[PDB]
Design a protein around this ligand. Sequence first.
Ligand SMILES: COc1ccccc1C1=C(Nc2nc3ccccc3s2)C(=O)NC1=O
Length: 286
Amino acid sequence: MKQYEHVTRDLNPEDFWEIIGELGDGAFGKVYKAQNKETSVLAAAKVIDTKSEEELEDYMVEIDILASCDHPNIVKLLDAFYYENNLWILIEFCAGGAVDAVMLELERPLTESQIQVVCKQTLDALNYLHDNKIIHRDLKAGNILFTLDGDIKLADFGVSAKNTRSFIGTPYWMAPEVVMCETSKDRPYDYKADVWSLGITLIEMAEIEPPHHELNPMRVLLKIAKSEPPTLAQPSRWSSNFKDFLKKCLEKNVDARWTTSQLLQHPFVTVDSNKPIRELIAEAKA
Ligand SMILES: COc1ccccc1C1=C(Nc2nc3ccccc3s2)C(=O)NC1=O
């Protein structure tokens, strides 16, 4: 009975959106390519089997995050429906596809000039999220999408979190940070997990695969905990700016690891043209 701001109930999503293809699979099942029947707008459509009202509430976090964000490098919510025990999420379509799929299709990594554009725009998106106390929690090249104009959008907020999400009592003993709602979850610490993932994603774009890709996943967790942070395999092929930006992300001491606000001041992401990505997608169309 709970009325959700952005979710229609009891209407058939396919009366409005026509499935015209498949975009891939994932933890939440198959993701379709859909087309609005009236406007012809394209969309990625998540279709999530949800049996109970409790499951619906859990999946709603992604919808409320997408609905609340308004940033050019973050995919927008187009529609959402709950119908025949499925939650449909209609999300802005990016026709350039995911960055990891591009590297696999071309069988080569991105160049540094291309990485620099992706890094700047992804950082812009991450900084907006952190400013709004959102943690993406699944950053990787597979969750960065190319537009046909040569920009990127950050996608798949399926495990993202609003990190800060009745009587008061006598207040005389409350700490100032309690009164001011500056809890540990309001501080930079937790959001910096995304900064680490950015650094791994940069190596992934530089080398097609992330560090430790050859290891069993359980062994990868041990390596992450125990090893020094990863570096580029062929460091002499890459600029000191790129390697330095990575060092500020791939820093195991969380307090020393840079915030997105600090990274935005770094010379690696002083760049004002997306032309390397326009070139990447222009040759791919040939
Ligand atoms: C990375 O993007 C998403 C991940 C999960 C759910 C939706 C998306 C997504 C698009 N692309 C693709 N989806 C999928 C889904 C599975 C596998 C590959 C792909 S590539 C898109 O254009 N707009 C979107 O929100």
